[PDB]
Swiss-Prot record, chain A:
Glycans are attached at residues 18, 54. Subunit of the fusion protein that is processed upon entry into the host cell. Mediates fusion of the virion and cellular membranes by functioning as a class I viral fusion protein. Contains a viral fusion peptide that is unmasked after S2 cleavage. This cleavage can occur at the cell membrane by host TMPRSS2 or during endocytosis by host CSTL. In either case, this triggers an extensive and irreversible conformational change that leads to fusion of the viral envelope with the cellular cytoplasmic membrane, releasing viral genomic RNA into the host cell cytoplasm. This is Spike protein S2'. Changing residue 38 to H: In strain: Alpha/B.1.1.7. Disulfide bonds join 2-46. Changing residue 21 to Y: In strain: Theta/P.3.
Swiss-Prot record, chain B:
It comes from the Viruses. This is Spike protein S2'. Subunit of the fusion protein that is processed upon entry into the host cell. Mediates fusion of the virion and cellular membranes by functioning as a class I viral fusion protein. Contains a viral fusion peptide that is unmasked after S2 cleavage. This cleavage can occur at the cell membrane by host TMPRSS2 or during endocytosis by host CSTL. In either case, this triggers an extensive and irreversible conformational change that leads to fusion of the viral envelope with the cellular cytoplasmic membrane, releasing viral genomic RNA into the host cell cytoplasm. The lineage of its organism: Viruses, Riboviria, Orthornavirae, Pisuviricota, Pisoniviricetes. It comes from Severe acute respiratory syndrome coronavirus 2 (2019-nCoV).
Length: 64, 49
């Protein structure tokens, strides 16, 4: 996914959607969770990967 | 992938299965996601000798 002009990759799991929302879950069991910055890492920009989508990444501490 | 030999077959795209396998020898995923064309060309040229 692409937020703020950057590319975010998952740490452990996959990106799934139920039609209108995006989540993160483990590969062997269905347990949805909300996307924050504590389970993704950023590398590069938004023009190298194929299939990038758009969303918003929750910042857990500073805007709270 | 490898799920058809331990239960029921479950679909998945190829470019993500390759990342799944590529994560098992040490290298991360963005290395694959940034060099898809080169790896495809290398594989295609390798099979054919």
């Amino acid at each position: 996914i692409c937020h703020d002009g950057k590319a975010h990759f998952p740490r452990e799991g996959v990106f799934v959607s139920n039609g209108t929302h995006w989540f993160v879950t483990q590969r062997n069991f269905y347990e949805p969770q909300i996307i924050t910055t504590d389970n993704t890492f950023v590398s590069g920009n938004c023009d190298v990967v194929i299939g990038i989508v758009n969303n918003t990444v929750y910042d857990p501490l500073q805007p709270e | 992938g490898w799920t058809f030999g331990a239960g029921a077959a479950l679909q998945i795209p190829f470019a993500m299965q390759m990342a799944y396998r590529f994560n098992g020898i040490g290298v991360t995923q963005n290395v694959l996601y940034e060099n898809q064309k080169l790896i495809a060309n290398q594989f295609n040229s390798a099979i054919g000798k």
